[PDB]
Design a protein around this ligand. Structure first.
Ligand SMILES: NC(=O)c1ccc[n+]([C@@H]2O[C@H](COP(=O)([O-])OP(=O)(O)OC[C@H]3O[C@@H](n4cnc5c(N)ncnc54)[C@H](O)[C@@H]3O)[C@@H](O)[C@H]2O)c1
Ligand SMILES: NC(=O)c1ccc[n+]([C@@H]2O[C@H](COP(=O)([O-])OP(=O)(O)OC[C@H]3O[C@@H](n4cnc5c(N)ncnc54)[C@H](O)[C@@H]3O)[C@@H](O)[C@H]2O)c1
Lengths: 481, 478
């Protein structure tokens, strides 16, 4: 049963000001879970004012010493650990991802990120700066203020926690809008946040839609900082709204056309295993997903053959079943877009190696699909599919594949598979990607920054670098008489 | 009697006429005469310069091949040249802006040299991290150059505001397209000659003069510019950042205006607080991003601060920028002059007390007492010689009133009391907080705005975060 469905302001639950509610549905059963309060600008304003009050100098939250902000973040992680089974179940109901993946990947990431950043609270350190004989000059990394977080539906809790953890450890307060498709875990986190003993108004949560709640957050004159995870087009709008309002600081985590490069000297079975996971994890609906699998011609045919085997053997079905590795797509909209891209694949001349249609009708499941013979100007090679489709391209030289890998407007991640030291490091430095994996895929750490080059994002999440998004530099310069 | 040698577009260390053939005049604001004509760039010329900057940034280019310490040697070479032609640069700055020659020589150009030398020493000290993860994993970060950087700068400190951008951008290994303000293009163009003489490879720095809505807009929306740095008005800063986001999501640094407060406590050195508040308000005819717009004085020293301020204001010399004695030259443009006098009149009509000045001779140094928060002279950036003096009672009170602005560039506090100094420094929402001084800038100290006064920071180690892109390399060992 879903207990938390309301708007969370000042550690209180609230009906929307309009009284309106919206439904969240289970993609696997195709049935409606519950209804959630549908917020709007009046609700954002009530949340922002709360966050402002909790942020005023002299408030309890601003009076906490640094280590007690740490201790609270550990207390949050501890409760998320206690109710892990329940949070992973709610994520599965909302997203369709396999329960065991939500438990061991999503929730594990949530706990690790919170503990990591908990330990940053009392180590956020500015500088003392040598100037003149009679001057004392130093800098302070102060909290930036009221922070908005807007997150997508593919990793609903994790993308929020990547925001909540650095922001709170730096002493900010927050307004959160989860995706309208996936509100359930955010709202649950809220009960845990009040249980952890965060003062009222430090974290507020307003569900609802993008053009209503989201745009009101990005345009709010008393929000100082916004962090957004989602599509490139909405991120442009969000940064535009931020600039037309009060010039709030913006972190953008956007899409990518992520390349995956398999050299002739790769461990081929490792490359196949990693490229398969990198394409198909979370039903393909992952910002890190491999959209272009470049395979050098010496192992092209054997890579394809081994990839078709993995794809034909990947279990698809009920996400609450131990055996499932692939649940359903998120909703009818995405389901249709993926099938249209598959058809363009066939129509544009790519060789269909397996799958390529719905799995059994009635459900939002798509057969895992592999295309070979894919070229750069094909649609399946140029567009984010957000579905279980592995397009495999061929290349000849390192220099050639660097150019084809970089000739995109995106740059979130890349992966290289080679046994050669020079090749690995030549590619790591030349690929214009925020993360370059070498002989691995989807290797994320709370302590390693993540984010995009070019139109894949602004700023970083995770690692010490996340702290720079959540703090404002102040120079204090004292002249001694 | 100085001749202007450089009037053309600078691309690939070559001088170019504009694609259109159009030119624009730049005028001495003190003689009111026309100095020369400058090539007027537009979108075609920007495209040409962005292509030069990309060819220069391509992997394997001479610029990308230089070792880190050679980038520093080149910046030091550019400082030696600027230092050599210091008098010539300051002269051009005086002709273009009207500020006194000695001010250009010992403030602007001095800051240009210091900033260049400072960031020269950063070039081989830009360091990423090695990050502990798992027993079988090698995770590190590279602080890579962003790529092609646009710089858009205003008329009040032309060269200095360019150099605050060029110095960290080159030292991190980017390439650049520079647009100086249309009113003040002369020292940018001359710096281009020294960039070539210093030996920067062609295309590393390109300069296109011209206007905001033509050249500046072509820069901020250009699909192959990776980064933009802007100094100017809040309103144009908002447009630049929006154009940047609408095109290709290029990274954007903004240094904008502010409603900068001074705060004078009862236990201040009053003569120090008077001298500094006077300099802050009246320096450069008030046309400085750091200018003081609100002077808060505790009631115990309020009337005496006003008296000494009035005397201090009545002695500052105003006149010809080429004369040794002048501390205040002319203003740049007609529009400010008129609105200053309108604000002066709103001050009278809203109940402020005019203590001195309040009319043209450009404008008499003016002091208002009995100013309150809701008055216009306390709420609007004046950017002219007007000293509004407000009264306060408690530290907590003046914190609220100083912070109830949408801005936050600088602030200055005057007090002999350790606790007061430090409580105010922590509590003020300002990117710089001066205690017992004013206009104390350092190439090693970051500078930049809280709130609507800016995004990002210039100067100091923090400047380097604006000109690098963080890459994570994660290697799993078998
Ligand atoms: N522009 C839209 O709202 C819209 C409409 C139809 C389809 N889509 C597509 O459907 C997919 C949705 O997946 P996603 O969640 O990763 O992408 P997304 O970028 O649409 O959504 C991410 C988050 O941003 C919010 N958001 C949406 N519009 C916003 C706005 N105008 N201002 C502020 N916040 C806003 C959403 O509510 C959600 O919380 C994407 O492919 C997207 O392009 C988007
Ligand atoms: C007018 O405005 C002046 C303000 O002075 P300032 O130079 O400090 O402020 P400003 O913000 O008007 O100009 C700063 C710089 O931005 C440029 N710019 C102006 N509009 C632009 C636009 N739409 N897109 C891109 N760049 C643009 C200018 O040409 C200049 O180089 C007054 O002095 C008066 O002349």
């Amino acid at each position: 049963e879903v207990k938390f469905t309301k708007i969370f302001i000042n550690n209180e639950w609230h009906e929307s000001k309009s009284g309106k509610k919206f439904a969240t549905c289970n993609p696997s059963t195709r049935e409606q879970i519950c209804e959630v309060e549908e917020g709007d600008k009046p609700d954002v304003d009530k949340a922002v004012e709360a966050a402002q009050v909790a942020f005023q100098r002299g408030s309890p939250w601003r009076r906490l010493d640094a280590l007690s902000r740490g201790r609270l973040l550990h207390q949050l992680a501890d409760l998320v650990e206690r109710d892990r089974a329940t949070l992973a179940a709610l994520e599965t109901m909302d997203t369709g991802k396999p329960f065991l993946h939500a438990f061991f990947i999503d929730l594990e990431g949530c706990i690790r990120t919170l503990r990591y950043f908990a330990g940053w609270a009392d180590k956020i350190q500015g500088k003392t700066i040598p100037t003149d004989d009679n001057v004392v000059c130093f800098t302070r990394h102060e909290p930036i203020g009221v922070c908005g977080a807007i997150t997508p539906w593919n990793f609903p809790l994790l993308m929020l926690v990547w925001k909540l953890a650095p922001a709170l450890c730096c002493g900010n307060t927050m307004v959160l809008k989860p995706a309208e498709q996936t509100p359930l875990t955010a709202l649950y986190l809220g009960s845990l946040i009040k249980e952890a003993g965060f003062p009222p108004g430090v974290v507020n949560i307003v569900p609802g839609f993008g053009p209503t709640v989201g745009a009101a957050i990005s345009s709010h004159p008393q929000i100082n900082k916004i962090a957004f995870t989602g599509s490139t087009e909405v991120g442009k709008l969000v940064k535009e709204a931020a600039s037309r309002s009060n010039l709030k600081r913006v972190t953008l985590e956007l899409g990518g056309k992520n390349p995956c490069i398999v050299c002739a000297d790769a461990d081929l079975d490792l490359a196949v295993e990693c490229a398969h996971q990198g394409v198909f994890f979370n039903q393909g609906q992952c910002c890190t997903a491999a959209s272009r699998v470049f395979v050098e011609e010496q192992v092209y045919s054997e890579f394809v053959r081994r990839s078709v085997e993995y794809a034909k053997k990947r279990p698809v079905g009920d996400p609450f079943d131990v055996k499932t590795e692939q649940g359903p797509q998120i909703d009818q909209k995405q389901f249709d877009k993926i099938l249209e891209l598959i058809e363009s694949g066939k129509k544009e001349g790519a060789k269909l190696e397996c799958g390529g249609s719905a799995m059994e009708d009635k459900g939002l499941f798509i057969k895992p699909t592999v295309f070979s013979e894919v070229t750069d100007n094909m649609r399946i090679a140029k567009e984010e599919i957000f579905g279980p489709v592995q397009p495999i391209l061929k290349f000849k030289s390192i220099e050639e594949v660097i150019k084809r890998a970089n000739s995109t407007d995106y740059g979130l991640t890349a992966a290289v598979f080679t046994k050669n030291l020079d090749k690995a490091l030549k590619l790591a430095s030349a690929l214009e990607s925020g993360t370059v994996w070498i002989n691995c895929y989807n290797a994320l750490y709370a302590q390693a920054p993540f984010g995009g080059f070019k139109m894949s994002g602004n700023g970083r999440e995770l690692g010490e670098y996340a702290l720079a998004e959540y703090t404002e530099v102040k120079t204090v310069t004292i002249k001694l008489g």
